[PDB]
Design a protein around this ligand. Structure first.
Ligand code: CL
Ligand code: CO
Length: 129
């Protein structure tokens, strides 16, 4: 599923991401935009052999099991394919573990490089939340 911006913002709010660990909703929408272009089916292979999955490009080295990443820790205890669902629940639940791990949203390189320090409120402007 390719979400609309406001549609995604609303789904994220319902799943409790607004101000989760102090990160306002716009941060999460901005991260999803640049990681996946709001497409739940996005996959991208990394240089280390791991793969990133779904709307928030969650990695198979640490977070989910794709059966082809040796030494994967699967800390979200899920198959990576679960993260490609039109239902974002699994992605959101795993993202909450990731942002809690100590580096906050810096765990998402796209967020650090393209969202951090910008007017992220723009990402939810106009939306009926
Ligand atoms: Cl933080
Ligand atoms: Co990535």
């Amino acid at each position: 599923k390719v979400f609309g911006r406001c549609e995604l913002a609303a789904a994220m709010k319902r799943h409790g991401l607004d101000n989760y660990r102090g990160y306002s909703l716009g941060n999460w929408v901005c991260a999803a935009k640049f990681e996946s272009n709001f497409n739940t089916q996005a996959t991208n292979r990394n240089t280390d052999g791991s793969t990133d999955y779904g709307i928030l490009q969650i990695n198979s080295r640490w977070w989910c099991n794709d059966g082809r990443t040796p030494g994967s820790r699967n800390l979200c205890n899920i198959p990576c394919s679960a993260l490609l669902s039109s239902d974002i629940t699994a992605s959101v639940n795993c993202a909450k573990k990731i942002v809690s791990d100590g580096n906050g949203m810096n765990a998402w390189v796209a967020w650090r490089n393209r969202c951090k320090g910008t007017d992220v409120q723009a990402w939810i402007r106009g939306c009926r939340l």
